[PDB]
Amino acid sequence: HAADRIARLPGQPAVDFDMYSGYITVDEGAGRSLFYLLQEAPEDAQPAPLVLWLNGGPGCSSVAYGASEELGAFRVKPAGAGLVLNEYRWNKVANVLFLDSPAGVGFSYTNTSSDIYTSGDNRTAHDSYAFLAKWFERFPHYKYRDFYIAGESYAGHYVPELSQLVHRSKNPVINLKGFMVGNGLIDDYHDYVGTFEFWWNHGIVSDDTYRRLKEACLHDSFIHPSPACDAATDVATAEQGNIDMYSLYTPVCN
Amino acid sequence: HAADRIARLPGQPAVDFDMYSGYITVDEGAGRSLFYLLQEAPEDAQPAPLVLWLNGGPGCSSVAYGASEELGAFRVKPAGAGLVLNEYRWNKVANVLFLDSPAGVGFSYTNTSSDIYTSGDNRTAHDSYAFLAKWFERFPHYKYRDFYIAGESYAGHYVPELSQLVHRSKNPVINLKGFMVGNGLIDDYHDYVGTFEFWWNHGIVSDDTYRRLKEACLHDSFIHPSPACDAATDVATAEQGNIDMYSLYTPVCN
Amino acid sequence: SYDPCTERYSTAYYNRRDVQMALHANVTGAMNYTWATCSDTINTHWHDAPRSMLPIYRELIAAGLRIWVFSGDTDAVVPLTATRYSIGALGLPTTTSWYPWYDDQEVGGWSQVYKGLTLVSVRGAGHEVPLHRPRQALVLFQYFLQGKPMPG
Amino acid sequence: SYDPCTERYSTAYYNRRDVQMALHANVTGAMNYTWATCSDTINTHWHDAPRSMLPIYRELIAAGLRIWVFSGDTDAVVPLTATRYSIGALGLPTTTSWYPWYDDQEVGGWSQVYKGLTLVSVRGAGHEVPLHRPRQALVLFQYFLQGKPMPG
Ligand SMILES: *[C@@H]1O[C@H](CO)[C@@H](O[C@@H]2O[C@H](CO)[C@@H](O[C@@H]3O[C@H](CO)[C@@H](O)[C@H](O)[C@@H]3O)[C@H](O)[C@H]2NC(C)=O)[C@H](O[C@H]2O[C@@H](C)[C@@H](O)[C@@H](O)[C@@H]2O)[C@H]1NC(C)=O
Ligand SMILES: *[C@@H]1O[C@H](CO)[C@@H](O[C@@H]2O[C@H](CO)[C@@H](O[C@@H]3O[C@H](CO)[C@@H](O)[C@H](O)[C@@H]3O)[C@H](O)[C@H]2NC(C)=O)[C@H](O[C@H]2O[C@@H](C)[C@@H](O)[C@@H](O)[C@@H]2O)[C@H]1NC(C)=O
Ligand SMILES: *[C@@H]1O[C@H](CO)[C@@H](O[C@@H]2O[C@H](CO)[C@@H](O[C@@H]3O[C@H](CO)[C@@H](O)[C@H](O)[C@H]3O)[C@H](O)[C@H]2NC(C)=O)[C@H](O[C@@H]2O[C@@H](C)[C@@H](O)[C@@H](O)[C@@H]2O)[C@H]1NC(C)=O
Ligand SMILES: *[C@@H]1O[C@H](CO)[C@@H](O[C@@H]2O[C@H](CO)[C@@H](O[C@@H]3O[C@H](CO)[C@@H](O)[C@H](O)[C@H]3O)[C@H](O)[C@H]2NC(C)=O)[C@H](O[C@@H]2O[C@@H](C)[C@@H](O)[C@@H](O)[C@@H]2O)[C@H]1NC(C)=O
Ligand SMILES: *[C@@H]1O[C@H](CO)[C@@H](O[C@@H]2O[C@H](CO)[C@@H](O)[C@H](O)[C@@H]2NC(C)=O)[C@H](O)[C@H]1NC(C)=O
Ligand SMILES: *[C@@H]1O[C@H](CO)[C@@H](O[C@@H]2O[C@H](CO)[C@@H](O)[C@H](O)[C@@H]2NC(C)=O)[C@H](O)[C@H]1NC(C)=O
């Protein structure tokens, strides 16, 4: 644990809280090891709760997003020259743990190359659980700490699937109090119906495309649309133009 | 006409186009006189088209809005200390005429005090027509100029009602080429249905309020809602909070 | 940079005699009331107003007039969806389906050209388009004066 | 001030050995590929995924867990309306109807408290809430840690 401690990052400004990063092996058979980043709260704030933050994709890095351009302690400089401190970082009130998941994402890796062509919700969750159970062994002063799980987007799946596991596990050192999801997947049918309605309601697609989308995708999964849905979706993409679909009214990077 | 010419406005920066403002009597009986503001285009751009711009309300001033915080040549300074030039002013390409209408709005006045309790679409349009027909007599070098009528909001009514009149009048000096409407009333039923849908789609009202609004207002006029519609609308106003309903994501003035 | 307090300034300004003098307004000083941005009375004492403008558009389209309809997409008073349904009810045919128009390299809004009428939305603009998106609002205006479709 | 180019910077940064050294990452240097923000392969080779999370929410609500759901209202990828319909389909009862929450004197977003779950939207924020509305995003977080409803 002390071994996982970070002294300083390049370009990092001086701070008053500790930080830790390293790997946990969740599958010795396969050689699957997840990388974490813990940004603690300041001493005075202790002992604060422990928050596991997960990014979506599927396939996107919690360190890459959560820690670096969202709620983490620092922001990266242009050209990747150094770090700047985040005035609104969440680790002001809690101990934030960022997990790169699944194996093959970010700094997280697998020793079984096949591993990356066969990921799914089930194994992602089981590895995530394993990671937590050993993480508490590496960091025993964290046992019994109120714990919360949070995430965005495809983590609408991750967060509740993992919470479910944690809960049914009945592990006595994990004091799960709850979870929070931002902009995430909940129910395929309803999300599709709502996505299209909001698009038409924001002037981003035509009346026809809107109708084609509803008729092409309602029986589909978000993750595995049919060819009719893809066709529909390709027209819409062309009606949307060169916009940041993740933030309708802000500029696109050049 | 030369008499209506403006030398300079207080605080006004130096410009390279002329400007004219004054009154036209549209009803000698009633003593109804409309005030106009003409911001011409630069010499080099001449001879440019003539554009009548109308603000809505009903009851709001085209000079107050159109000319002063929208498309007009200048912007007013805090405390109303002076003017600043508008870099994107429309009078770069056209001769813009701003009409205060109806009688009782802005600088526009009536000699019959009753006049202001009985305004309606019909008389607004007839006075507007009268104004144009005499305005061309005051400014004869404008006859035959391509003419366009434009406006916002409640001018969704004004613009097309006036265009209709101009067209059926067959006045040979008015070369009406068309009209343009921004964010305006078109059809009461459809606008109500669309307004509520967009609101729910922008997170500004609850699921219940949305349903109550549809059920309370669909048979109504925008301008004269029923008491059921007003009740519904009062709840919505309370769900919206302290926002600028005219621009969802910009700040409110303090 | 946007200042949501403009009406205030305007109120102060047009109320100076200086200015009214300069505008040839309330010459005899006979306007027995302060200058206001809108008239409340008028506003709250409106009478006749048809429920639909659709019939008139039809007459003027048949007449061959140039007709453009626009919308600032972040207004909530007379929102974009209200305009989509009302225009949709004219039943005109589409000449060029909903497409993104550019100003520079940014999307300025979307447009749809129907036989007889052009629909234009302005991205990120509130009710008062030229206030919120001045630059894109001038483009809009120039294309209409020409009768050319929104670019890009 | 917002810079829409952050992923770029991050790509450059995490790719330095300096940094990886500092993080105790790719220690043996054995990661036979450049560092990326997401993994394409992974992304395009996903297998199992249920269609609904509703059943799980039900189980965890019944379990008594604290559950908050939030939404940046200008995201178009997983938009607010998608979340309104999905949460609406849990059928829970409402404890406090949709109301505006403030941060200072500005409306931060809207909220609805149901029996077992709290729904929060963030005004003007895109998909990555803490990036777009950092300040309001910290408020959000603090209230949830406390189990207190959004204020104002
Ligand atoms: C994923 O694959 C890595 C490439 O094998 C592998 O790294 C290797 O770790 C070996 C085993 O634990 C290690 O081996 C023996 O070590 C000693 C050296 O002191 C020798 O006397 C033995 O004959 C072998 O050399 C080998 O040195 C090492 N190679 C490299 C490049 O590091 C990983 O397995 C192990 O990774 C480490 C760092 C840790 O997880 C270890 O305890 C792992 O089993 C493997 N990563 C996994 C499985 O998570
Ligand atoms: C709205 O009401 C105004 C108050 O009456 C009125 O203004 C008055 O205009 C009168 C008439 O045209 C004018 O009168 C006569 O003028 C001469 C002075 O040289 C005398 O010899 C006569 O015995 C009367 O005095 C009177 O001076 C004037 N009063 C004021 C305060 O200006 C408006 O009527 C007229 O307004 C003008 C400026 C213009 O429109 C005139 O030609 C109008 O009939 C009236 N405004 C209207 C009806 O539009
Ligand atoms: C979801 O994922 C869990 C855990 O990954 C699955 O359960 C695991 O099932 C596998 C076989 O899939 C077991 O692994 C082998 O078991 C033996 C050890 O006793 C050895 O052959 C070997 O070394 C392991 O690879 C594993 O024990 C088991 N883990 C747990 C926590 O139970 C689960 O798959 C099913 O669940 C199994 C327990 C069993 O029913 C399998 O045969 C199943 O496929 C996954 N759920 C889904 C989508 O099937
Ligand atoms: C819409 O508004 C037009 C014009 O304002 C109306 O037509 C006008 O009708 C009035 C009576 O309302 C006429 O005014 C009087 O007529 C006499 C002059 O010959 C004199 O008594 C007097 O000095 C005037 O006040 C006016 O001539 C007429 N103007 C026009 C352009 O025709 C119209 O109302 C109806 O249209 C009239 C012509 C006639 O049918 C009236 O009796 C009507 O009320 C308005 N439309 C609506 C909503 O009724
Ligand atoms: C027309 O000019 C009038 C004369 O100045 C002016 O009336 C004013 O009313 C004031 C209140 O805003 C009062 O304090 C001041 O004395 C002033 N003058 C007189 C003698 O009444 C009107 O506001 C003006 N009409 C407008 C602006 O429509
Ligand atoms: C793990 O460290 C590796 C060693 O530096 C690194 O591999 C690199 O691959 C480069 C291309 O981006 C190559 O140009 C460079 O020589 C470098 N080193 C070697 C010897 O291969 C990996 O990118 C790194 N893995 C990550 C970042 O996941």
Residues of B belonging to the active site = 153
- Three-state DSSP class for A235? helix
CA-nearest of A96, A103, A97, A107 to A124 is A103
Rounded Cα distance between B133 and D108, Å, is 51
Chain A nearest CA to D13, separation (Å): 4
Geometric angle at alpha carbon B229, from B223 and B235, rounded to 5°:
120
D105 lies within 8 A of chain B by CB: yes
A contacts of D60 (beta carbons < 8 Å): 160, 163-164, 167, 179
Rounded Cα distance between D131 and D144, Å, is 19
CA A223 to chain centre: 16
Rounded Cα distance between D66 and A180, Å, is 8
Q: Which residue of C has its CA nearest to B251?
A: C4
Rounded-to-5 percentages of helix, strand, coil across chain B: 40, 20, 40
B204 lies within 8 A of chain D by CB: yes
Which residues are registered as beta bridge partners of A146?
A175
Which tokens is D135 given?
A: 């300040």
The distance in angstroms from the start CA to the end CA of chain C is: 27
Rounded Cα distance between A207 and C85, Å, is 10
Q: Which CATH number fits domain D53-147: 3.40.50.11320, 3.60.110.10, 2.60.40.60, 3.40.50.300?
A: 3.40.50.11320
Total number of residues shown for chain D: 152
Is C124 annotated for ligand binding? yes
Q: Which CATH number fits domain D5-44: 3.40.50.720, 3.30.70.600, 3.30.420.40, 6.10.250.940?
A: 6.10.250.940
D contacts of A9 (beta carbons < 8 Å): 19, 22-23
Q: How far is the CA of C35 from the centre of ligand 5 (A)?
A: 8
Give the domain range for residue A91. Answer: 1-254
List the alpha helices (DSSP H) in D32-119.
Answer: 40-44, 54-62, 80-88
Nearest protein CA to atom 18 of ligand 6, as residue: D29
Ligand 5: does its nearest atom lie under 6 Å from the Cβ of C18? no
Geometric angle at alpha carbon C140, from C137 and C141, rounded to 5°:
90
Which tokens is B101 given?
A: 């209408």
- List own/partner pairs for C56-60 with CB under 8 A and 24 or more apart: C56/B160, C56/B161, C56/B163, C56/B164, C57/B160, C57/B186, C57/C90, C57/C117, C58/C90, C59/B164, C60/B160, C60/B163, C60/B164, C60/B167, C60/B179
Which tokens is D60 given?
A: 């965890």
How many other C-beta atoms can be found within 10 angstroms of the C-beta atom of residue D58? Answer: 14
CA C149 to chain centre: 18
A202 lies within 8 A of chain B by CB: yes
Out of B198, B201, B249, whose CB is closest to A249? Answer: B249
Rounded Cα distance between C78 and B38, Å, is 28
Rounded Cα distance between C151 and B46, Å, is 25
A245 lies within 8 A of chain C by CB: no
Rounded Cα distance between A75 and D2, Å, is 12
Rounded Cα distance between C65 and C62, Å, is 8
D contacts of A92 (beta carbons < 8 Å): 138
A contacts of C99 (beta carbons < 8 Å): 239, 241
- The H or E element containing residue B24 is strand B19-27
Taking the CA of residue A206 as centre, how many other CA atoms within 13 Å lie in the half-sphere pointing to its CB? 23
Chain C nearest CA to A152, separation (Å): 25
| Cβ atoms of residues A163 and D60 within 8 Å | yes
Taking the CA of residue D29 as centre, how many other CA atoms within 13 Å lie in the half-sphere pointing to its CB? 3
At how many Å resolution was this determined?
Answer: 2.2
DSSP assignment of C60-122 equals HHHTT-EEEEEEETT-SSS-HHHHHHHHHTT-PPEEEEEEEEEETTEEEEEEEEETTEEEEEE
Chain B nearest CA to A201, separation (Å): 6
Rounded Cα distance between D35 and D28, Å, is 15
Is D123 annotated for ligand binding? yes
| Cβ-proximal residues to B145 (8 Å cutoff; 6+ apart), any chain | B47, B49, B50, B95, B175
User: How many domains does chain B contain in total?
Assistant: 1
Q: List Cα–Cα distances, D32 to D11, D21, D129, in angstroms.
A: 16, 16, 33
Beta-strand relationship, C66-72 and C117-122: parallel
CA-nearest of B193, B110, D91 to C32 is B110
How many other C-beta atoms can be found within 10 angstroms of the C-beta atom of residue A245? Answer: 16
CA-nearest of A18, A16, A15, A17 to A1 is A18
- For the four alpha carbons of C138, C141, C147 and C149, in that order, the dihedral sign comes to positive
Strand runs labelled E in chain A: 19-27, 32-39, 50-54, 74-76, 83-85, 95-99, 146-152, 175-182
Q: Could you give the dihedral angle defined by the CA atoms of residues C150, D4, D8 and D13, in that order, rounded to the nearest 10 degrees?
A: 170
Domain boundary assignment for chain D: 5-44, 53-147
D115 lies within 8 A of chain A by CB: no
Kindly list the protein residues whose Cβ atom lies closer than 6 A to any atom of ligand 1: A 25, 31, 33, 111; D 28, 30
Rounded Cα distance between D130 and A72, Å, is 9
CA-nearest of B159, B227, B220 to B195 is B220
Return the partners of chain A (3 or more C-beta pairs < 8 Å).
B, C, D
